[PDB]
Symmetry: D2
Subunit: 347 residues, 4 copies
Amino acid sequence: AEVSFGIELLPDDKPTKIAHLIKVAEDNGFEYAWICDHYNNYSYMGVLTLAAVITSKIKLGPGITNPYTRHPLITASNIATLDWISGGRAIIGMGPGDKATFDKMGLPFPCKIPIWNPEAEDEVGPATAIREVKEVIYQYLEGGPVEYEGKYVKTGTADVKARSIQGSDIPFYMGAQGPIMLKTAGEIANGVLVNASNPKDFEVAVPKIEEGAKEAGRSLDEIDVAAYTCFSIDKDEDKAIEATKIVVAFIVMGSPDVVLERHGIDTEKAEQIAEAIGKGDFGTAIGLVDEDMIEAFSIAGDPDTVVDKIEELLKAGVTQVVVGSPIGPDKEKAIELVGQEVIPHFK
Amino acid sequence: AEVSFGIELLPDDKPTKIAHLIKVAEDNGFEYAWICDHYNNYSYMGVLTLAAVITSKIKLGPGITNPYTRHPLITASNIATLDWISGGRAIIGMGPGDKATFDKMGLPFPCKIPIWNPEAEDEVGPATAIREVKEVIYQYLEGGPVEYEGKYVKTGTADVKARSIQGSDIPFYMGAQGPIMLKTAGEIANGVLVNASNPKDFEVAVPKIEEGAKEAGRSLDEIDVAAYTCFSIDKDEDKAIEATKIVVAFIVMGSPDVVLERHGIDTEKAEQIAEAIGKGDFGTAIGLVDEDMIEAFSIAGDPDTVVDKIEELLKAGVTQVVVGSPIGPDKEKAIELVGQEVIPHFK
Amino acid sequence: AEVSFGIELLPDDKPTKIAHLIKVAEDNGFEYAWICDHYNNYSYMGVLTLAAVITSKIKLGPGITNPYTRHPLITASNIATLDWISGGRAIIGMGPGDKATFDKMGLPFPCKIPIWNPEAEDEVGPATAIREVKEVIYQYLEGGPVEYEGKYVKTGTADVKARSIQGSDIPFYMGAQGPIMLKTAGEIANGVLVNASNPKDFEVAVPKIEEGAKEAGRSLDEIDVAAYTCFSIDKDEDKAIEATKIVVAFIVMGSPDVVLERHGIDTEKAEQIAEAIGKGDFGTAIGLVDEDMIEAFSIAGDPDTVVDKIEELLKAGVTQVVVGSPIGPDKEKAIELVGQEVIPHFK
Amino acid sequence: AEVSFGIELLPDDKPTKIAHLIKVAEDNGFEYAWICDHYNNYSYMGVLTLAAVITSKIKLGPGITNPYTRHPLITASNIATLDWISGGRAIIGMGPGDKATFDKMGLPFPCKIPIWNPEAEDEVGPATAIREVKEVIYQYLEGGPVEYEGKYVKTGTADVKARSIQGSDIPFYMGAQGPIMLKTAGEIANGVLVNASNPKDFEVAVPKIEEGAKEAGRSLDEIDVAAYTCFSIDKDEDKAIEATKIVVAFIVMGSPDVVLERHGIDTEKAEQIAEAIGKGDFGTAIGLVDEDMIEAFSIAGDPDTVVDKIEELLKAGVTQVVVGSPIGPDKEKAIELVGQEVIPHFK
Ligand SMILES: [Cl-]
Ligand SMILES: [Cl-]
Ligand SMILES: [Mg+2]
Ligand SMILES: [Mg+2]
């Protein structure tokens, strides 16, 4: 897979601002734009349809949605609709849901409910649910009728009228953190969205993606390994680094101990950070974030530093660098700084 | 409620055509535009967001969506997003799902699964599910956090960031056919979407809506009674009538016997029509549709005939006339004929 | 005329940012959005059409265009097109051109060329050119054919196919600074756009607008007197005031001596400012701007100060307060501060 | 130049319909969309900006605009704005104006007024005016400042802030009918828009375009020779042919005698057609159009016939086939028939 840059925006801000930033990213050479799917924010279909209207080249899609909060045939319809309206630019980001959001919604997490197979009662693994949603979506994109009986979803004979433009050429990316999801993604996905920003995370993740690819007779180069990063760039390195703190603080808090161990993180001023958060004291949280946490969980600094860090990620197997929150002290100026002083070094 | 005209479009056609027709309706004085929610067609969020971009005054919303195929917090987010993007023009159409579509999806119908309350197993009546989805949506529109524990949905503490423009002023319309849904709609809805086109249907339905309104201390005039009609208008009455046949044939097929009895329908050349359909022989189906079926199940003819029919519906309690399929031999010319020779008679 | 708030944006920034800011203004209660017409920036038709797509209620139009750089029939077409696409929200801002821009283009200023009457050679006064362009535009909006023979424009029999939505109800605002333009605007315009921010300017201008209105048998209340202001608002008054300096410096430079005299301006540290500018030394320019210049040529400060200043403008006859550059240190936060803490005081 | 298909739409219809048809063309493989520039219709900037929002791949631009009705710096701004909003898809179509429209506007035709050089009085040839407008536009697209002193336009030092995306890569197409314009286009244009639909017209035109190209050291293959055709396609050849009549009737009327001679046209039932038109009797006009006129002035018939006709045009040097009015009995179905049964034969 060729090297590319993506942008991931949480749609909590005004939809028109989110659309405007995606146009700035397109104008600056970014090739992918991912919009998160959480009920508490503006809906990905509304925000991406508005972004589709305001852009012409960048690929657009949910990053990431899930098999549970909407029937897979509804997700298929959304993707086909976004693809048609955008002139064939849709992409799919699919994951297993997320704990913080599912707890708020009232859904269990991991969610093992065979929600869309009414006659089943047996729990279903999230990786299996994702495989099934994928089959339903692509049967829909091929024009149907969709006929699928799995453990998590069982359809009737579902005819399809809506047509996309790319059809089954729409890329399927899977969110993956653990070994099971990483292996499944190497087997069935066009790409993998890994929430990580450091080469060490990919030295661990890529071999597992490759293991799944081999079992499917695929080469690792058929898979776009996308790093969903905490990213911060500014001509003033100190300012860029400072902007990452609140985000890194939350990352440190939600990182399993093997991840903290991997990055040699002060497990003391960790969780101690988790106590500052949840307590609503983000001020002490930010104060506790040190240089090792910033190096482990973000790509931050001036263009030179950022370019150096991306070179190391690419060596570790990353092929799509997704610029995520905070992006930079000023999001728009940050995107432009990436297009002007980072992307040209990788063309 | 004041008299108004709405338009209902199935989004199976190109999204840009559907958006264009909604703009033509707005330009012609229609005040509501309803887009159906069926997985087999383009998604209502994509189509309505595109229509929102291409229009400025007409109210926009799903007509009708349901409590089952998406978590109610996702439906709330969709509505708040459409409202924000449209500058405060969203409306909600909520029903219990529909048999033809749910069978295709693999969901039972009626759907009594307490889908969004994982710890519950007991069946829940569709009217109760609709009441619960309504509470969740309006808690979301008030800014949350949404905290609701019902029989069909149980949430955690769901904070909300997305903000709409109308907030809880967004109108809530309920689809209703039977006595239980009609009474529930009079109790909790700003309006009722009744799939019918004849005064006799409303002479039966309105008293039941009124019964629910009284139990909630409301006057019937607080409720917009909307007729979701089979509508066909043309300067050539014969051409208008002919265009209704395929649609009336399907209506005749899916009408319970009390409805056929109500309209004195030839129960013989009924079901005989149902056999022509399902058999894929629509040609004999159309040939069987007679004048009584057309009078019972559509508003069809030249402007004079249409105006006369609407006057009788208004006398029966209808306050919003929703022009639905086929609309007319030429949909755009039909919409214009309504704006030029029908609406001015009712202003 | 009722009290209203408008926003004026120079379209030198990204079109999507300009459109986004207009949506923020609409969401905050602004009722007018004016986009300047200068060849060096993005075109008003492109920017306003994009803004029309992203908004639903705010009125939109050029503020201000002119009779010279485009044939009046082309300007009419632009206005009818913007009106149709926006669902009947167009407004017209028409002035005589501007020296800085016309010099750059190569056109004389004042421009007295009977540009659009090929057989004429005699000079035509700008106020007469504006009267003629107005007649051509409204004949076009009435559906034509336009047939007009004046001193500045002579048409053939120009049929018109394009239709607007408001027709001749589209408001005609005239830019006016001197006595002749002010009187003409009171006679023929629905509103007047006066580049000024202080009550003293309106105590001079309003009586002249009123004189023209009386000669046309009109009451002054039929005319929307709009102040095109240098505006700066922030919760930190000092920060708001500082943001106005570069803009006030340019205003001081281009102000005729009667205006400087009117505001008791240090004519010494004036022109001395004009020498700093033109010399490219804006740093000394800003340093020279004092409190009297800021009070004379801008509405700047915290919400309390701003509200007090608007009250005095309204007493002087202003009915539309147009928030113009810089708007505030952060344009979007400034617009929101106006919607939250200024507009509600005037409702 | 590679073979491509374009679509040319007169914007007299609803802007949203024109935008929708351009999206249908894009979805069907058309690579260019041209919108005429006549004051009596909706403005090209409004219609193309709306089309830009609704499309993502097709190239968009005025086809054709002119040097006279707007200052060339305003045309430059329009093009840069359309290019930016469309994500770098703008194209320029530039011609000398047109008699029917200029007479209606009151401008002479040919228009030889040095309109934009106030100190000049000497007449300027239209080909020279087009060369000058081209220089001004590209200086603007290079970022300026534009400084140009010609016979038809003389600017001051015109700085430029607006930026396009393609910069000087935006293609410049010139409308050309006669020898002088054809030669000029071969010398200075990326393409030529020739109003003709038959191989004989191109056997005459191409050598002249080639003569200009050689004088500029260019190969004929650097020039996209675009046929602006009267086009009509339908699965029913007779229906397709019938749809061309009104349009061919007008073409026959406005064709110089050398063109009528070239196509062996009955000069009797010609002008006799011109008398039916202008007299408002289009019914006799259509009745007079014969097979030779249809063969000479349109590409009409079923897909097989159309494909055969395009093959002959390509042999005559055409490289872009522009489908123009009527397009087909049903414009949308016609566009789809071209994408499904014509374009694939030429890929
Ligand atoms: Cl959805
Ligand atoms: Cl223009
Ligand atoms: Mg686009
Ligand atoms: Mg709108």
